[PDB]
Structures are given as structure tokens and as C-alpha cells.
Write a protein that binds this ligand. Structure first.
Ligand SMILES: C[C@@H]1O[C@H](O)[C@@H](O)[C@H](O)[C@@H]1O
Ligand SMILES: C[C@@H]1O[C@H](O)[C@@H](O)[C@H](O)[C@@H]1O
Ligand SMILES: C[C@@H]1O[C@H](O)[C@@H](O)[C@H](O)[C@@H]1O
Ligand SMILES: C[C@@H]1O[C@H](O)[C@@H](O)[C@H](O)[C@@H]1O
Lengths: 311, 312
């Protein structure tokens, strides 16, 4: 079965690490952190890895039940919630995944809305509530691999114990010094001092002059100063496509061309690696300034020795 | 002729095309009295997007624009006038042949979400940000997205900035009480109440007796009050994306599809997938379709409109 990519322009793609549209392509060659995100991880022959799942609505989402309000040193009112799989089935900690699929894969204060629809009814319809909430993924109480996490609210009382609870992610609460936003630092999925397991592997350029190419989205902020971004290796639609197709990878590296369909011209070429990430021959950091109607077209299978035309 | 195909996605791998929600169940309601003419999740089988349908899951019931004015409510809350652009940031051209900016909500109700802002201008050199819960009443006379402006209301009384880039992230509904006017099949008046909506995707209905529409149903969160509201779409967003990609020619007015259990390989039921992008089944009851979670629709063959479906 021939390998293919979807024909979706940048303006028709979404981020696989947060529910955002792709805003720009981006490079950062001098990045010192190990790039090992766990969402938006899929091999070219369609094997989902890390915490990656298929739903755009599942990325950085949680489902579960609030248990109780809990004490925390930090500002706000805090709540423990058990978490299930996104499909409602119990999360089995013995499954070979880092955490429930969809779990956030970076350190930070994730801002969103907690909503509840009660199990018990009264015209035999249940009571509901929703409030803004923050999940600090760096907190010692962030233990999704153990089946429970903690969130904080501004609301002090109107969160119900033992009721079905949904977290809808919206952005970040803050990127100030004490908010520990670092998109390449993984949460400790089982808690402080524990080793993460079953991780999707780190990615890096191997060839001289090459750097990773990211699909970048700017992420909203609840408050404060900043213009934070989330970089994914492949957009969610590519994850969905590769998973569907399951085309055998005929080498370790696919040559792809970024094409302008209006002119038919190649703007640049890139290596699409077997494990599901892109590299380009670029010697600068920052956005790739190109029209959003551009898209990657699969050209051919090459190998690690192939030399990319400089961007 | 390029062969017609559907994605192989189970219900648990599909999302709603009319609100950012996972698909929870398949659903029928044969005695529905309303005209079904939703505008999101509309796509012909040969890949033509219709109504206000666009491809991004993040675009469904989303808005982008700038706040222009603060207006206090008489009783409670603050209202904010917002000019809206296309979701890609370009100016919305009201003369374009669409009902409203793509992504605009396609139903009457109080849509609950978060308005966020990231300022354009900066002596620190990082822009200021804010976000607050917000409600958009799509039935309101001030909901005129085809004219390029809407209004949202907040509990927050002051901290929303004018002239700054503004994003609406939908989350659910504010209420489904009587005075919240939730009706998933009542279209907003995109240009205001005395004006006719234009460029609409056509209404959908079964043509043959004994058939009813089959919906992909999602339950939508509530900010408060009692209720278990649901949003039914004609096709999931992944189907829209797939059909748009493939643009396979339609070889008849109807694609026969089978809902299959891959574990047994057995067909659970069959359905007509109509040219205009919707499903009908031979079922004479309302409610969820009880079917295994591993199930998915498989394209069988092109048939004729006169094809008689096996009763469910
Ligand atoms: C619920 C809380 O209401 C307060 O007035 C706000 O200042 C906070 O941002 C938060 O939204
Ligand atoms: C930078 C400041 O952050 C705060 O949280 C906001 O409430 C202000 O409007 C401002 O944007
Ligand atoms: C921002 C407002 O804060 C209040 O305390 C809440 O009761 C309202 O639901 C709303 O969220
Ligand atoms: C029915 C009631 O609606 C209100 O909005 C909520 O604040 C309460 O918790 C309760 O669910």
C-alpha cells in the first residue's frame, strides 16, 4: 500500500498536543531540551505511541469523578478527581502506556473548564455545573497513571463530590516564573520521584545541518504577560491519516515537498522520519514564513544519507 | 472513477461536526416535527462542503474577532459587542456565498465558552492576556454574524479589552431552561430576525416510508441547571474531512453502508448514505442504537434511491 499524507493546508490542520489550529511552521535548532512529547506520536505505518489517541476532543482532556476538596499550599480551591479512560472505561494502570490516552504531555498550568452532569435525577433530569479550573501538571498530586489528578478552581464550593466530571482544556493559566511552563518537560505521570514508563522515544535530527520542523500553535492565556506556543511533531490530522492507512514504511525516511498549490512550486523539502517527525536543512530559529495554503506532498522514500536542499 | 470510501473509525474514534464533542451514540427520532437543516457538518459525498462547514475541529462554534463596546445588562451581566472575522483572521466578506462565517453555530441557544484575548501592542515586550467565561445567545437580535458582528455576555464586569484579538472557545451550553431557547434544529437568523438566511445547506429527510434519519449524537456540557442536552450531527467531523479529501465521484444518489462488528465480521444493520451527506435507516422507534463499541460503517456499494433497507 502506497504511503500518502493528507492534502490539508496549514490553515486546515490542528495541533496534536493541544486543541488549537496550526498557526505556523517553526524551527529552533539550538533547543537544548530532549524533544520527547507523548501526544501527536504516530509512526509512518500508523502505530500510535505515547499517550496519543485519535480524538481532537481528547487532547489534554480528562474524564472521571470528583472525590473531595483537598488541601493544597497553592492559591485557589483544590479538588481531587479520579480519572478514567476517555471512553469511560476504567483506566488499567497495567496497560503499556505512560498514562491515560489524552493526558497532557508537558509541564504547566493547564487552564480549562470542569463540568459535571449528575448521575442521579429529579423531570427526571440531572443537575449540572461548570467552572473554570487549572491543572498543574507538575504538581505531586498530578498522578494520572495512578488514576487520579488534582485541579484548582476560583469557585470555592460549587463542585460536587462523586459526580461525573469532564475537563475541557482551553489554554494555560499563566506562564509566569512559578507556573513552570515548559513544553518539553514531561509530567511525572505517577507522581514526584517516579520514573515514567512506556514513553514514545525522543526525536532528534541525525544529519548535519538539519533541525526539527514543528507545527506550532499559540495557546491562550487566562492572564498575565506572554505569547506561549505549543509545537507538535505532526498535526492531529496526520495522526488520524497514518493510523487509517497503515502503509508499510519502505525506508526509514520519506522525502516530502512543501508545495504551493496556487503556483505548483516547491517551497522547500523535508525528511519525514519513520517514527513520525520532520527535519529540514535550516540554520535559523523562528517561523517558516510561507502561505497557509501550503501543504506537504509525499515525493519518495529516501534514506538517512539523503541531503536536503537548504531552506 | 475514484472509488468511494469512508474512514474506518469506530464510534469511539469520531467527533461531532456541530459542536466540539466526542460521538457518544447513534440515535433516531422518527417523530421529529422540526425541519432538519443544520449548517455545520454538511458535506456532499463527493466532497463539497456546504452551509457554514469548515474542516477544523477547533473551528466548530468558534469565533475570532475584536471587542468594540461594553454594554451593561439591565439586570445582571455585561455584554460585549464583537466584530468577527473569518477564523483564519482575514476579513469576513458578507457578500461571500455563505450563510455566515464558517464555523458559526447553527442552532438556537445560549452557547457557553471562554473568551480569551492576547493583545497586539506592548515597556515590557510580552503582550498582556485575559480570559473569562462567556455566553453567546444565538437567538438574540444582536447575533448577526453574517453582518460581521455578534455579542457575548460575561459574568466578569470589566476585564475584557476593546480593539484586541479575541477568541471564543466553545465549551457547552449555559442553560436549557425555557428562557434559554435551546433548540438544536432552529437556525439562528444570521443577519437578524427580519432577514432571510441565505446560501443554506438544504434540509434533509427520508424519501421512502418507514425510513428515518440516523444521527451521531453527543451530549453537551451545561454551565448550570437541570438537563441532559444533546447535539445530533448528520455526519461526524472525520467524515467531512475524509469526503473533502477524497472527492470521489458519486455513482448514484445513495451509498449503501453496513454497520459492522469487526470482531465477528457481521453486519448489525444497513443504512442509506445519501448524496447530500446524511444517513437514513429502516427503524420505527426513537432512541439510541444499542451497538457494540467496536462497530463502524463500511461502504458496501452504490445503490438506487428505491433500495429497500433491511429493517433494523
Ligand atoms: C471565577 C473567577 O471570577 C473572578 O472574578 C475572576 O477575576 C477570576 O479570573 C475568575 O474568573
Ligand atoms: C496582563 C494582565 O493579566 C490579568 O490577568 C488580566 O486580568 C489583565 O487584563 C491583564 O491582561
Ligand atoms: C465568573 C462567575 O463567578 C461566580 O462566582 C460564579 O457563580 C459564576 O458561575 C461565574 O462563573
Ligand atoms: C441545578 C443547580 O444549577 C446551578 O447552576 C449549580 O450551581 C448547582 O450546583 C446545581 O447544579
Amino acid at each position: 500500500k502506497p504511503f500518502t499524507l493528507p492534502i490539508l493546508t496549514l490553515g486546515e490542520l490542528t495541533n496534536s498536543r493541544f486543541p488549537l489550529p496550526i498557526d505556523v511552521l517553526y524551527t529552533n535548532p539550538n533547543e537544548s531540551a530532549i524533544v520527547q512529547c507523548q501526544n501527536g506520536r504516530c509512526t509512518l505505518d500508523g502505530e500510535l505511541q505515547g499517550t496519543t489517541q485519535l480524538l481532537p476532543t481528547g487532547i489534554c482532556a480528562f474524564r472521571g469523578k470528583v472525590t473531595q476538596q483537598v488541601q493544597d499550599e497553592h492559591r485557589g480551591t483544590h479538588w481531587n478527581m479520579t480519572v478514567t479512560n476517555l471512553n469511560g472505561t476504567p483506566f488499567d494502570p497495567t496497560e503499556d502506556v505512560p498514562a491515560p490516552l489524552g493526558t497532557p504531555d508537558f509541564s504547566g498550568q493547564i487552564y480549562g473548564v470542569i463540568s459535571q452532569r449528575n448521575t442521579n435525577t429529579v423531570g427526571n433530569l440531572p443537575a449540572n455545573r461548570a467552572h473554570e479550573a487549572v491543572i498543574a501538571t507538575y504538581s505531586p498530586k498530578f498522578t494520572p497513571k495512578l488514576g487520579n489528578i488534582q485541579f484548582s478552581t476560583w469557585e470555592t464550593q460549587d463542585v460536587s463530590s462523586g459526580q461525573p466530571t469532564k475537563f475541557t482544556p482551553v489554554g494555560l493559566a499563566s506562564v509566569d516564573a512559578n507556573s513552570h511552563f515548559d513544553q518539553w518537560t514531561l509530567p511525572s505521570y505517577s507522581g514526584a520521584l517516579t520514573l515514567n514508563m512506556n514513553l514514545a522515544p525522543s526525536v532528534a535530527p541525525v544529519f548535519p545541518g538539519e533541525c526539527l520542523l514543528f507545527f506550532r500553535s499559540f495557546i491562550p492565556l487566562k492572564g498575565g504577560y506572554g505569547n506561549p506556543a505549543i509545537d507538535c511533531l505532526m498535526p492531529q490530522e496526520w495522526v488520524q491519516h497514518l493510523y487509517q492507512e497503515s502503509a508499510p514504511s519502505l525506508s526509514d525516511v520519506a522525502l516530502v515537498r512543501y508545495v504551493n498549490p496556487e503556483t505548483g512550486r516547491t517551497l522547500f523539502e523535508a525528511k519525514l522520519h519513520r517514527n513520525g517527525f520532520l527535519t529540514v536543512a535550516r540554520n535559523s530559529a523562528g517561523p517558516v514564513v510561507a502561505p497557509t495554503n501550503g501543504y506537504f506532498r509525499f515525493d519518495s522514500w529516501v534514506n538517512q544519507f539523503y541531503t536536503l536542499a537548504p531552506m
